[PDB]
A paper describes a structure:
Functionally, as a group I chaperonin in mitochondria, [name] forms a complex with the cochaperonin mtHsp10 (gene name: HSPE1) and serves as folding machinery by facilitating the proper folding of unfolded proteins. In addition, because [name]-[name] complex is the eukaryotic homolog of bacterial chaperonin, GroEL:ES, it has similar biochemical properties with GroEL:ES directing the substrate folding process using their well conserved hydrophobic residues (10–12). [name] [name] ([name]; gene name: HSPD1) is one of the proteins whose expression level is notably increased through mtUPR yet it is the most abundant protein under basal condition within mitochondria.
To characterize the detailed in situ structural properties of the [name]-[name] complex under folding stress, we performed subtomogram averaging using particles extracted from stressed mitochondria. The structure exhibits the classical features of a football shaped group I double-ring chaperonin: 14 [name] subunits arranged in two stacked rings of seven each, capped by a heptameric mtHsp10 (10, 11, 28). Under folding stress, we also observed structural asymmetry and substrate-dependent contacts involving conserved hydrophobic residues—such as Phe279, Tyr359, and Trp42—lining the inner chamber, indicating active substrate engagement. In addition, we observed extra density at the base of the chamber, primarily located in the region of the unstructured C-terminal tails (residues 523 to 547) of [name] subunits, which displays connectivity to the substrate density. These results suggest that under folding stress, the [name]-[name] complex increases its proportion of the football conformation as a structural response to elevated levels of unfolded proteins, thereby enhancing its folding capacity.
Residue numbers in the entry:
A (entry chain Y), B (entry chain N), C (entry chain H): 0 to 526
Amino acid sequence: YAKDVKFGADARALMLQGVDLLADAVAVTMGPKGRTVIIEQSWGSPKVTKDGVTVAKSIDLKDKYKNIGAKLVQDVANNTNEEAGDGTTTATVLARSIAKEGFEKISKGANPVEIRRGVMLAVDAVIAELKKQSKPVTTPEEIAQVATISANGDKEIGNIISDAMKKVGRKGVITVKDGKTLNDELEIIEGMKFDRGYISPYFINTSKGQKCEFQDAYVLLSEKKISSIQSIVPALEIANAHRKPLVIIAEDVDGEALSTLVLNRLKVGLQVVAVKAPGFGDNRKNQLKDMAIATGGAVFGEEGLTLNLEDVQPHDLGKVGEVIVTKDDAMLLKGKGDKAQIEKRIQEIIEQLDVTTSEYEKEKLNERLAKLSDGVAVLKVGGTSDVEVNEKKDRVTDALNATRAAVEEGIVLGGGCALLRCIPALDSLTPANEDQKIGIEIIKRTLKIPAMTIAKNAGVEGSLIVEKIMQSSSEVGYDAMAGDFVNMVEKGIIDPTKVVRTALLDAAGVASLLTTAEVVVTEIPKE
Amino acid sequence: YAKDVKFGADARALMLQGVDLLADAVAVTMGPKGRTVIIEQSWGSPKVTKDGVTVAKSIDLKDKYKNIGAKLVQDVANNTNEEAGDGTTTATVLARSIAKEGFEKISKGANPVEIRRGVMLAVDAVIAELKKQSKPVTTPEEIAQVATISANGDKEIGNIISDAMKKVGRKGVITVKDGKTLNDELEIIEGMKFDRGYISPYFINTSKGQKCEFQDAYVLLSEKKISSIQSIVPALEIANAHRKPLVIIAEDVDGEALSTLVLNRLKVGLQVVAVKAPGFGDNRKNQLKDMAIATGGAVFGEEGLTLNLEDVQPHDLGKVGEVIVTKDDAMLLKGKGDKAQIEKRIQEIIEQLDVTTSEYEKEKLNERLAKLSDGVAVLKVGGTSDVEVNEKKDRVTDALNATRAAVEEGIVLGGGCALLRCIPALDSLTPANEDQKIGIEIIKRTLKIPAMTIAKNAGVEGSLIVEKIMQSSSEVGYDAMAGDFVNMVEKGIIDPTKVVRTALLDAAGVASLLTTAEVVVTEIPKE
Amino acid sequence: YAKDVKFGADARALMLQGVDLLADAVAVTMGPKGRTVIIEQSWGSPKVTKDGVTVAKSIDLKDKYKNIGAKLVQDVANNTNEEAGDGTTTATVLARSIAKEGFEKISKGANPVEIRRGVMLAVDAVIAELKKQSKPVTTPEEIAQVATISANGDKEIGNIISDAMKKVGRKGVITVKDGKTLNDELEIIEGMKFDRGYISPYFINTSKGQKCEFQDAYVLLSEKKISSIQSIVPALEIANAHRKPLVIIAEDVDGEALSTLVLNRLKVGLQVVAVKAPGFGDNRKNQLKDMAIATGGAVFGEEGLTLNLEDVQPHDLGKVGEVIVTKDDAMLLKGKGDKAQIEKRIQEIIEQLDVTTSEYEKEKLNERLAKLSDGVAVLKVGGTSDVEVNEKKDRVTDALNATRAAVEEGIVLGGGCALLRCIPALDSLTPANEDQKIGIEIIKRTLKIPAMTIAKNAGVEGSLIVEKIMQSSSEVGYDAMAGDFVNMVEKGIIDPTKVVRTALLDAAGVASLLTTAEVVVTEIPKE
Ligand SMILES: Nc1ncnc2c1ncn2[C@@H]1O[C@H](COP(=O)(O)OP(=O)(O)OP(=O)(O)O)[C@@H](O)[C@H]1O
Ligand SMILES: Nc1ncnc2c1ncn2[C@@H]1O[C@H](COP(=O)(O)OP(=O)(O)OP(=O)(O)O)[C@@H](O)[C@H]1O
Ligand SMILES: Nc1ncnc2c1ncn2[C@@H]1O[C@H](COP(=O)(O)OP(=O)(O)OP(=O)(O)O)[C@@H](O)[C@H]1O
Ligand SMILES: [K+]
Ligand SMILES: [K+]
Ligand SMILES: [K+]
């Protein structure tokens, strides 16, 4: 395939136009007075978003040379999402500023490799200073403030997130789902949800709602399918002797066992129910064992130390204070497993979690941890239309990510005030020569851009706001929503350290290396 | 397919334009002040590179007649990579210089075949003089200097490479892998890594990390799959009699043996573990025998002298002081094989290595040598993005190649100073007639180009630098990074002989033969 | 398909332009100062060649009417290659000269059929005179001179070819193969090479190189596969009784026989080896019988006079003084077959060679002859690149062809001096009428062209050189490389008769018949 090659200033010029166009497109969404973007979809209704990384990833340009810069800065935003999930617009504005200035600063005498090296040194100093500036999290009021900021100032969302974190712990499982109502709702899930329904309608004993409700039931856990009359009779005999209900959790129930169970239940009122085993593969076995410890029962049919169904004993069955079964799910509430083994299981699970990490295994392990310890919370997001629901869940997910991050790390000043306060640290650096001298001064001049961009999106002159803020004491900042100068901490306009430091480091490294180009090669367009 | 034919001066002119364009494109990356090139990729993010051969192989032009010269000089660079892996830009600059001058020198009276013959004679003299100039390697400081030069002046990379060579020997196995961290790290691998995990989770005995840790274990090596209770019982009986742990390395474990092993381990605490055999085909057998000598054990089931599992004896099992097994790998640390047989095995392996050579077999043999003698080192290259990681591993691989080459051969002056010092040798040649007289003078005028190119990339006039250097004493040279005249040896700016001599010989031979063209034929472009 | 038809002078004109263009393209490569041609390849690197027939076959033109002449004269060159493999440029220059003059000589009154008849008579006289001029070959110095001429003056190639002919005889087998080194090498193959490796690594007895080396071994030749223990035991018993090594050459070895052999070798040190039979089909049988006579053994399992393995006798096994077996090949050096049967076999083979001829059967028969009598020589051609290696093997193959031809026939003056000296013979012819008078004068004027072309390629005026040569005594000629007049025989610039006579006859007949055209029909180009 034939290709075209361009050299030097023209290539840099097209590079910078492409970067500027993409970054201008993304920048409109930033801050409390930013606006949303709609992206056309070829198969239905277009999404409406205020998400920088979404905008960046959604834009590709026909012009080949602009396309390099476009794809690189969309990747920068994508990396920001990959790591923090937020801060992406800040990363983008930093990237455009540094790339632009570098392109208009490069000269015959400059040496980009030392320039970038000095950039790396200065940014490392910046993150060091930020880490020294960080403060721990202590109050639910602070978490709620962070959540409100991340949710674009939605106090109801912030309150719901704070309540959820209180209920499920700061490391609990929170999931977002579409609502069918005008208002958002917080639903708390306790115990064990495993999405298996009743096997036979005959087992229903509660008319209102067609529910199976039993008290003080025996628990039978079978890893393998239950088939034989000889395998089933001893357990039912034990249950009838003790006059207690029985719940049978098994891989499957075969025709003969199912017919016997339903027929006996119909003709005697025998309190029995059967349900499918949850999870597939080794996951099924994991849940079965976890339930065994939780209820104080045993798992029958294990490959190691195989325990036979023919000789089931009364002490091998778990005990649960309440069981609720419906068409979609089944519930055991008050297991009777011993606390010491429960603690052993939780400890081993967290150790397994700490050894090897992947998205699937971490998700399953976290789900198990919550199920075994505290439960999970699901926030259902309501709305009149799919586009509106999507637009709000975007902000809700951003808020959740931000709150989790502010749980892992400390806080810094929001609104760019932390970055503005970081300028004195760069004045202590001593460059060995001109290339890093240029790098440090560039960083000292670029780190300020977010505040100007925020003020511009607010319709005020960022230069005047930043000058008054930097001339003010460290505890004073500018609230862009009110349009005033205030002490930021009492208003609660604060940001997590990790997001900003990651965005700065990634954007600076990537774009600063980009600024070393002299020649660009692209394929000639085909017919 | 219809084709077009052109004759003489026009064909040569287009040839030289194509060569010049490609070589100009490649030359920007050369030397300490060279810059990087980005190459568009049709399936994702574009690579950023400073690699001459990569640039050359990545460029193809639409114009048919330029394309001949383009492909020939990319091949020249490719040959340089095929042999040295470095020096490719130097080879390219030599090729362009000689090709250009030849094209603008050819005349009715010239006879290219004697011209090229004289070129070959003179270059042979040049390599002879270089080989006389070469000096052996003696110090880790010199190796570190070479590594730093090849890594584009990265002292951290040079230090890490020097430490790696110290740990694994000058002929050890070093591999490059992607990092997940901001900084590079050096990891040392001792013993035998074979990438097989534990067969059964039941065998785990260490809670923290889910590891199998055993001391003074017996080693069972089975080439074939282990199936029968009769085949397994004697070994477990021996192990229990001697009250020592057992590790079973076998092709596979069947259902009955696996169930018996896991059940016994669970019910008694019997110290047993089983793992898959590593390697496939005859490679598996090779590792099994090598482990047999290493541990002092025997291999059961061999086709020759078949040894039965039914009559296993205590002395047929290897002994190892420590074994560590985890999900991904297993480790035996302190084998008890006899040193004389270990030495016999290493000797036979190196003899096999010396008989027949191919990339796969050499790789496997080197891996075995390191595993049996000293181990292997892996350098993990960190970074914030795939493009950055790729760009740095390129330089790291170049550096590794350069250090290996400087281990095989001697050193010469870097920066082109060796080639500049080679001019007096050509003044001793006596040509028989005009065609070789022209060839020798051409070589004497072209060998100087690298220094001018280095100075030009440094932004200084190569003619003045080269003149002052050649007017200076032999031990004085110009450091392009500082921009000064210095004694090169103390600064450590030195180059391996092989790379330069190979690049010179290949470039001269190929392009000098190319300079014999009069007519070029290409196919007419299709619609 | 619609077609276009043209008549007379226009058709002849386009015919001659096409012939002239193609011939001009080819002519640049001729003689000691000719240059090379590069031909574009659509799948990789273009070949570089100095070969007239290659150039001619590689050229096709879009213009339909030129294409007839182009294809006809490429065919002429191809015929020259088909017969001689050299002389192709001379044939082409003769063809263009005669075709051109004929086209510009044809007139209303000329009768081309008698013109061509006279051409045929005169050329027949020319070959008669050449055959009278021919002289036998007597000295290795003369063969070396011929080889040097054909190799474009390469004395190293000429020396290597002369040494090869000395080692393997003037009718031995010589093959060309790619080298992996900078220099060419001559390798001599004696005995029997059949490209089969050892069946089992267990049979290896020499550590250095992993070779099977045995002395005074028995030879077992089995046409069919060896399977049964009953079939194998008697031979091994005989070998152990006589305490001599055994080599088993068989179609294949089955699992049981292979296991027994390897196990016995391992446990006793029994000197046995097994190898695959070489050749497929009846070729396998031919080699097996030939080895039977060579070693004095017998072939077991033949369809006629089937000899059983169960009753093998000590005298049925061949004897060989030394056997070397490695991974790729096996060698028996000093067979003990009776000379009278060896001579009978060689005689029958050469008689079979003389009865029926095809390329495959002749190749196999010649290979067998060399293997049974003297062995074969392989010249390995070195070089830095595939294109260079190809360019040199082309000349080497040309040289081999030329030396073989000069072994079959005599010699004449090179440089066209023989053809120049042939002019007096045509002055004795008496034409019956004008058409053959024209034919004879045309031939007398065209036969001189090669010398002018040689001088033109040398950059001197061929007319003056030819005039001085023809004015000189018969033993004096012009060396174009030095540019002087010399006695050709002492310098050794001489040519084989067959190549020149064949080229002249084919070119004259074909083009002279071509010169009888009046109308040309071609298809109208499609869309
Ligand atoms: N009312 C406010 N007053 C002052 N600063 C504010 C106010 N509201 C938000 N900010 C600041 O806006 C910045 C975040 O804006 P935004 O979320 O649009 O940028 P981003 O995180 O880069 O974009 P994205 O969410 O797509 O990654 C924070 O620094 C925050 O402190
Ligand atoms: N600071 C320096 N002063 C003087 N010479 C230097 C300096 N740094 C590097 N050089 C010289 O640059 C030359 C190598 O440059 P470079 O690696 O770009 O060329 P190349 O090896 O042909 O390219 P490639 O790595 O793609 O094969 C060496 O001769 C080296 O001595
Ligand atoms: N140094 C020389 N002096 C005089 N004549 C020479 C000299 N070298 C070669 N020749 C003559 O050149 C002629 C052969 O040239 P060349 O091989 O190029 O023609 P060709 O055989 O028709 O081409 P091809 O090899 O493609 O078939 C011979 O007649 C040879 O005697
Ligand atoms: K935003
Ligand atoms: K380079
Ligand atoms: K020729």
